[PDB]
Every structure is written in C-alpha cells, then in structure tokens.
Amino acid sequence: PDYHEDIHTYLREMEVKCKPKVGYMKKQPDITNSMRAILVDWLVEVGEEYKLQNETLHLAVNYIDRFLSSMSVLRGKLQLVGTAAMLLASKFEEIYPPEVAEFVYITDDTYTKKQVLRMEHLVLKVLAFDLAAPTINQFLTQYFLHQQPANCKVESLAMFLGELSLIDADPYLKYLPSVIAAAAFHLALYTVTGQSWPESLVQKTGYTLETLKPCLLDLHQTYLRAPQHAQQSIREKYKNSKYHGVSLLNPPETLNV
Amino acid sequence: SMENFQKVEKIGEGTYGVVYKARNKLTGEVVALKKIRLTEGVPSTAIREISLLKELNHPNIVKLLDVIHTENKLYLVFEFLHQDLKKFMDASALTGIPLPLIKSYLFQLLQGLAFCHSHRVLHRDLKPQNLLINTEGAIKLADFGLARAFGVPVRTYTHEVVTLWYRAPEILLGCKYYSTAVDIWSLGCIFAEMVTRRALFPGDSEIDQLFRIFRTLGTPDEVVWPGVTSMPDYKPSFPKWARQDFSKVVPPLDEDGRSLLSQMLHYDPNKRISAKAALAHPFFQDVTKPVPHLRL
Numbered sequence: 001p002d003y004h005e006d007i008h009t010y011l012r013e014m015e016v017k018c019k020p021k022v023g024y025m026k027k028q029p030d031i032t033n034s035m036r037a038i039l040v041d042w043l044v045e046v047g048e049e050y051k052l053q054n055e056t057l058h059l060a061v062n063y064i065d066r067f068l069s070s071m072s073v074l075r076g077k078l079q080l081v082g083t084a085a086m087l088l089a090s091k092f093e094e095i096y097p098p099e100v101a102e103f104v105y106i107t108d109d110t111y112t113k114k115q116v117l118r119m120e121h122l123v124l125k126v127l128a129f130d131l132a133a134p135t136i137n138q139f140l141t142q143y144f145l146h147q148q149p150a151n152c153k154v155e156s157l158a159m160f161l162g163e164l165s166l167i168d169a170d171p172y173l174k175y176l177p178s179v180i181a182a183a184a185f186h187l188a189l190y191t192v193t194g195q196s197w198p199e200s201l202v203q204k205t206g207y208t209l210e211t212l213k214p215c216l217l218d219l220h221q222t223y224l225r226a227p228q229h230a231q232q233s234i235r236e237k238y239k240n241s242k243y244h245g246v247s248l249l250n251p252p253e254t255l256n257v
Numbered sequence: 258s259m260e261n262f263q264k265v266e267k268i269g270e271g272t273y274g275v276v277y278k279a280r281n282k283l284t285g286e287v288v289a290l291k292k293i294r295l296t297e298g299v300p301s302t303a304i305r306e307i308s309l310l311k312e313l314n315h316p317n318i319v320k321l322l323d324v325i326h327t328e329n330k331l332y333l334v335f336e337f338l339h340q341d342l343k344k345f346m347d348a349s350a351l352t353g354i355p356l357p358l359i360k361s362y363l364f365q366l367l368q369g370l371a372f373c374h375s376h377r378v379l380h381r382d383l384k385p386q387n388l389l390i391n392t393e394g395a396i397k398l399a400d401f402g403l404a405r406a407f408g409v410p411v412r413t414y415t416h417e418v419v420t421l422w423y424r425a426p427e428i429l430l431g432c433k434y435y436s437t438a439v440d441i442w443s444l445g446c447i448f449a450e451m452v453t454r455r456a457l458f459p460g461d462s463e464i465d466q467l468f469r470i471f472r473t474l475g476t477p478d479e480v481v482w483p484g485v486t487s488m489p490d491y492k493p494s495f496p497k498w499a500r501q502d503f504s505k506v507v508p509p510l511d512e513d514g515r516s517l518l519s520q521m522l523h524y525d526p527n528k529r530i531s532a533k534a535a536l537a538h539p540f541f542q543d544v545t546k547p548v549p550h551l552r553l
C-alpha cells in the first residue's frame with residue numbers, strides 16, 4: 001500500500017497515452033472487426049497451449065490495436081502482426097517465454113521465422129518500444145483488494161468478462177482499460193454476491209455506477225450473448241477449475257442501474 | 258543516427274554487447290553507447306530495459322537519450338557518467354568516503370528508487386557496480402537489464418534475482434512473492450558498504466549468505482518475522498544466532514544512521530522501510546551535496 005496510490009495514478013496517465021485510435025478499423029481497407037475477433041480468439045488458444053499469463057494476452061492485444069491504429073495491414077498479414085505481438089508480450093511479461101520456434105510452429109508454417117522476427121522489429125519501431133502498457137488485468141487486480149471479503153468466483157468472473165471485451169473492437173475500443181475493469185468488477189460482484197461497485201472504489205478511481213453505465217450496459221449484453229458468440233475460446237478457457245468454472249455461471253437478466 | 262557519434266573508447270561489457278564512451282560530433286555531448294547485437298530476435302532483457310527506461314526520467318536514474326534501431330544492431334544512447342560506485346570506493350581507500358557524501362549518495366539513491374517503485378518498476382540488481390557517479394556530485398541507478406514492471410498485488414516473478422551479496426532474505430528463503438522491499442534490502446547493504454568499504458554479507462553460496470545474515474541480524478523466528486518458519490527454503494535445523502547489538506554492525510555509524518540502516522535491513526518485507534518513507538528519516542536532516550574529485 002506504500003505505492004498503491006502512486007502506481008494507480010500513474011497507470012491512469014499511461015492508459016491514456018497507450019490508447020489505440022477508436023476508429024481505426026474503418027480506416028483499415030482490408031481487415032474487419034470480425035477478422036480481429038478471430039485473431040484475438042486464436043491468441044487466447046495460444047495462451048492456453050503455452051500456459052501464458054492472462055496479462056500477456058492483454059498486452060499482446062494492446063500492442064495489436066496500437067499497431068493497427070497507424071499501420072494498414074492486409075488480411076493475410078494480420079496473423080503475422082498478432083504473432084509478433086504475442087512474442088513481444090511474452091518476452092516482456094513471462095518468466096519463461098516460448099521460443100520463436102514455437103511461435104513459428106503455431107502459425108502452421110503460414111510464416112517463416114525471418115518474417116516473424118522482422119515483424120517483431122517493425123512492431124517495436126511502430127510502438128516506439130513503449131511496451132509497458134496498462135491493461136484491464138492490472139486495474140482488476142487493484143480493484144480486487146477492495147472486496148469485503150475476497151471471493152474467488154468474483155475475481156475469476158471479472159477476469160472472464162474483461163477477457164471477453166478483448167474480442168470485440170466494437171464496442172470496447174472506445175473504453176479505457178480502467179473503465180472496462182470497473183464494469184467487469186461491478187458486473188462480476190453483482191452476479192455472484194448481489195453487491196455493487198463499492199464506495200471505496202469510488203474514492204480510489206472517481207468512477208461511479210453512473211460513469212460506468214455505458215461500458216456496463218455494453219458488457220452486460222456481451223455477457224448475455226456470450227454463449228452464441230462466434231468466438232468461444234474464452235468461455236472454454238474459463239470452464240477450468242483454475243478459474244472456478246465461472247463461465248458456467250448464469251448472467252443476471254437485468255442490472256438495475 | 259550513428260554517423261553523428263565518434264567512439265572514444267570501450268568502457269564496459271554486457272551480455273549482449275559492449276558499452277562505449279562516445280561523443281556527439283555536432284553538439285559535443287558525451288554519451289555511453291550500449292550495443293546489443295541481434296536468433297531469438299530482440300533479447301527479453303533489452304525489451305524490458307528499453308521500455309522501462311523510457312518511462313523513468315529522473316535526476317537519479319541513468320538517462321536513456323535515444324534508441325538507434327538498425328537491422329543487425331540496437332544502440333542504446335545514455336547520458337555519460339564517469340565512474341561506478343565500486344571503482345570509487347576502491348579508490349577511496351585509507352581516506353574513507355566522508356559521511357556527508359555517504360548521506361548525499363544514499364539520499365539520491367533513495368529518490369531514484371522511490372521513483373522506480375512509484376512507477377511500478379523493480380530494479381532487482383542494485384549493487385555498487387550498477388550505481389554511476391559524475392563529477393558534479395550525482396549518483397544514479399543504471400543497468401535495468403534485470404528490471405521488471407510489477408503489478409498490484411505482485412505475482413510470483415523470476416526467482417533468480419539480485420547478485421547474491423545484495424540478495425534479500427525473502428528471495429533466499431524461496432518466498433512465493435517478493436516486491437519493492439528487495440531493492441531496499443540491496444540499498445541497505447550498499448549503505449553499510451559505503452561506510453565500511455567492505456561488503457556487508459559476502460556469502461559464497463545461498464546457505465552461506467543466509468547464515469551470514471542470521472549471524473548479523475539474528476536468526477529470524479515467528480516473533481520477528483511471522484510466517485518465516487513455513488517459508489519454502491526455511492529449515493528447522495538453521496542455527497539460532499542471537500541478534501547483534503546493532504552499533505557493532507557498522508561501528509562508525511551514528512544513532513540516526515543506525516536507525517535507518519536497521520529499518521532498511523528489517524527481516525519482514527512488510528515492515529522494511531520504503532524508499533519514499535526513508536527520505537524523511539532524521540538521518541537526512543542535514544544532507545548536502547558534496548562534489549568529490551574523481552581520479553578519471
């Protein structure tokens with residue numbers, strides 16, 4: 001708690017600086033939201049295969065969105081971008097990152113090692129080496145400390161919801177990681193325990209149910225529609241006992257905000 | 258671009274390349290150039306060192322000025338500092354580092370570290386060799402190759418961290434979690450070393466390092482450090498040394514100095530003083546900024 005407020009304050013500054021351009025997809029000639037969902041869902045599978053941290057997945061997605069915010073990319077190269085992003089995220093975040101050989105392997109030899117490493121370099125150049133970006137995950141773990149008391153199901157369900165938001169650029173590109181985390185945390189808390197966004201988090205974050213509402217109504221729909229979404233890797237992942245099988249919990253019919 | 262730099266000489270060597278002193282031909286600025294040669298692509302250590310140094314602008318952190326990004330090579334451009342604290346202490350033999358300079362250096366080190374921690378970075382390799390000093394009385398944290406961005410609360414991170422002599426007890430005992438306190442332990446050891454000009458805990462192995470610590474500060478029990486006896490590499494067979502009169506650990510140290518050192522070497526990482534809080538310690542009440550004369 002010595003640095004908890006300083007760090008939170010600093011992450012609130014950095015997330016604004018690391019934010020992708022909300023409208024970049026309409027500026028993309030060849031790729032679409034659906035193609036991006038397919039990529040992100042595949043990254044979830046890659047994270048599962050190699051048992052990577054959730055943070056690593058969140059970082060890779062941040063890098064991809066920032067990259068696509070200024071670089072036009074043909075659909076045949078979208079996976080190369082995602083692959084180099086996941087490699088960078090792993091190098092940054094993981095104790096034992098997978099080897100390049102492994103990232104080359106999971107693209108089904110769609111690309112060569114040389115291509116992957118050249119893309120790694122280009123991603124680094126385009127992001128100005130600014131890889132230490134705040135994620136939904138980093139805000140959630142802070143918010144979790146305000147539980148009374150802590151509840152594993154709430155924590156896993158908030159992680160699950162925050163992860164679902166990575167899939168759909170529309171609508172989640174328009175929300176900051178701290179806001180999505182607040183929506184995910186309130187939604188999870190309310191689903192499991194019936195409780196709401198705690199007063200202590202209003203003091204910490206300045207966010208209220210009112211300011212969270214737009215993100216929250218988006219996230220509630222996403223939660224309700226999750227069983228029918230084209231992409232299912234995250235639901236499959238959160239069946240694991242590692243996450244207390246929270247994807248099997250029923251979403252609430254209404255939120256009453 | 259590299260064309261504007263004239264290489265003066267080699268000055269160091271890392272694990273992925275060498276450090277050169279160079280000068281900017283156009284502006285005159287003297288710099289250090291860390292060259293990182295590029296089959297796993299850009300090394301993870303360089304990815305962390307660069308991303309984190311870019312965000313860490315502070316008078317007491319070595320300044321990354323630029324990154325030069327060719328196909329086969331990565332050049333990190335730093336402000337040049339003249340000498341490291343280790344070389345300085347060796348050259349200060351029979352003179353000692355005067356207390357006002359020790360105090361100023363520690364105060365500066367603590368500001369640089371508080372800034373790292375406030376920005377969610379662990380350094381993880383604080384030792385005299387990685388602390389650089391200039392001809393103006395400054396000292397700065399350098400080599401962030403082993404650093405990492407942490408989260409709140411922390412996850413389990415890499416176990417193989419911190420040069421052994423400077424390595425905190427919660428790392429040696431295999432704790433699932435460590436955080437900012439590990440860097441304060443290191444600075445504590447360095448504070449003591451500036452005073453005595455010898456390493457405080459010069460162990461040759463992990464168990465030797467633990468025993469040296471125990472013999473100086475007492476073998477920790479549940480009273481001094483709740484939870485210690487259940488830690489993964491704690492052993493009930495550990496000899497049980499009494500804690501030393503702390504004035505004997507660093508004899509030349511005054512009352513305020515001993516108080517501060519003892520809080521930096523507190524066993525429980527939870528109770529170990531933060532860099533931030535340490536800045537207000539009465540030890541620093543009369544701190545100034547002496548300018549030592551470097552031999553080179």
Ligand SMILES: Nc1n[nH]c(N)c1/N=N/c1ccc(O)cc1
Pocket residue numbers: 268269276288289291306319335336337338339340389399400401402
């Ligand atoms: N020897 C030196 N004089 N001035 C420097 N900046 C310098 N080296 N600084 C560094 C900085 C970063 C690093 O990983 C290794 C050395």
